[PDB]
Ligand binder design. Structure first.
Ligand SMILES: O=P(O)(OC[C@H](O)CO)OC[C@@H](O)CO
Ligand SMILES: O=P(O)(OC[C@H](O)CO)OC[C@@H](O)CO
Ligand SMILES: O=P(O)(OC[C@H](O)CO)OC[C@@H](O)CO
Ligand SMILES: O=P(O)(OC[C@H](O)CO)OC[C@@H](O)CO
Ligand SMILES: [Mg+2]
Ligand SMILES: [Mg+2]
Ligand SMILES: [Mg+2]
Ligand SMILES: [Mg+2]
Ligand SMILES: [Mg+2]
Ligand SMILES: [Mg+2]
Lengths: 252, 252
């Protein structure tokens, strides 16, 4: 498979998922319908999203690792799929939620070759391949902020910080893209419990890196060895080259 | 002037402001074009919104209290106007920003008779009059959550809190309505510097009160005496009757 295919497949999937979610009233969306292989509940919105996505994906030589249904398939290409990220927002009609896809030649993020995050409420399309990072077809790049006094997306603040702004939107996949296009200066998930899962962050990280960002684990450790499995968890410190180590110092 | 008038005026304003912002490219929206009477910079997006609003508003026998142009007019009905709340989200194409109007028979919040908050990105219309609180025409009400382990919007968290989720969206006017329709369980702005301004919160508070919420200042004291002037500042603690005092203890 190549990044050209990944784009088509992803775009095809975005269409069906967007269509499914939009046609579903909020009353329905918010209903708990099952237990997810990930160990959290599967809302109805999660379900109709995943089933739409899977039906397109199965047809490929991939191993899908997805939030509600767990690990599916045998293919040598691994696909980290959050069928619906920001599920909570979508149940309340809050317009920040996305489908997220990260394609990789192995079960490790270091071998990622395509990232896709598509805002299902606005139609904003983020992706990245070897040619760079895009938002609705246009090249993007992170910001050049040098001072800690910046615009931060941070899960979760637990003390007094020096940021200009803090925001928490509820879709890590989308929020990493907000950082990738430079809307925010950094993205931090520093929650002690290590909460982010591979399908939440993979596409977002890849897109953010191609956009020029430095994206690491909690102590600067590279993320290259993170696995496309259900047990994997992540902290993330993401910011441009200059700003990044200043942040690593700050949360120490 | 009556609550039916304010509805019409508000809708007329919403339309013209929605139009002005939509036709403005992000590159233009984000330019600083002046200093607001509020003491924070007026973005181009703020300016085009306010000019659109004032155009309609100053045809009325009102005193307008607005973010960029300050106190205008001389009528006996006071109008707290945030021509554009969530201005930062608007300059990044992040879909959580609104126009906010509160109409009052005196210069005090206790004499409010109409509240209006229109999400300029989604077209979701929140308002409230004597007949209750509405979202796109449908009645709304707050959540019956009883435990501190709930869904919170909190500016800004600075310690370990017991909430289920925390979110910060960047539009206090809109987020007050998220609480009012029960999307979230509580809204807290407990920033020690007292950052919120009259036009940021007035409409939101009214709508939330008309929807069953208890909405107070930091210590539980009534907000009824808060003034429609530029000098006024607020902390907010909003939750349903049960949850509310539990929150009051928590933040001491
Ligand atoms: O069921 P909800 O939508 O909460 C969603 C999360 O449990 C989903 O993982 O409603 C609010 C409370 O969390 C429920 O008691
Ligand atoms: O536990 P959270 O505070 O909130 C969870 C809800 O957003 C579930 O949809 O953070 C986790 C998010 O799911 C990460 O994208
Ligand atoms: O859009 P900004 O200019 O972004 C901050 C940095 O890029 C400036 O150095 O900040 C917004 C205004 O300060 C709000 O009043
Ligand atoms: O973190 P902030 O300083 O706080 C904003 C509050 O006044 C709520 O509307 O964000 C500032 C931006 O100017 C916003 O558009
Ligand atoms: Mg998800
Ligand atoms: Mg997720
Ligand atoms: Mg989920
Ligand atoms: Mg404003
Ligand atoms: Mg404001
Ligand atoms: Mg402003």
């Amino acid at each position: 498979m190549d990044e050209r295919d990944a784009l088509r497949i992803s775009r095809e999937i975005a269409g069906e998922v967007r269509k499914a979610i939009a046609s579903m009233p909020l009353r329905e969306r918010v209903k708990d319908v099952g237990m997810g292989k990930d160990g959290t509940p599967t809302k109805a919105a999660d379900r109709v999203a995943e089933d739409a996505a899977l039906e397109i994906l199965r047809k490929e030589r991939v191993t899908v690792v997805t939030e509600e249904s767990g690990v599916l398939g045998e293919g040598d290409v691994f696909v980290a799929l959050d069928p619906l990220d920001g599920t909570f927002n979508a149940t309340r009609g809050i317009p920040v939620y996305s489908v997220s896809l990260c394609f990789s030649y192995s079960d490790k993020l270091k071998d990622a070759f395509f990232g896709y995050v598509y805002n299902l409420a606005t139609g904003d399309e983020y992706y990245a391949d070897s040619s760079g990072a895009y938002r609705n077809g246009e090249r993007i790049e992170v910001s050049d902020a040098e001072e800690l006094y910046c615009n931060a997306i941070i899960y979760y603040p637990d003390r007094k910080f020096p940021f200009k702004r803090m925001r928490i939107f509820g879709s890590a996949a989308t929020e990493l893209c907000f950082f990738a296009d430079g809307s925010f200066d950094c993205f931090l998930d520093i929650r002690p419990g290590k909460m982010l899962r591979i399908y939440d962050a993979a596409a977002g990280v890849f897109i953010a890196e191609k956009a020029g960002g430095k994206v690491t684990e909690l102590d600067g450790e590279s993320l290259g060895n993170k696995k496309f499995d259900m047990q994997e968890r992540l902290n993330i410190v993401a910011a441009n080259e200059k700003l990044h180590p200043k942040l690593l110092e700050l949360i120490k």
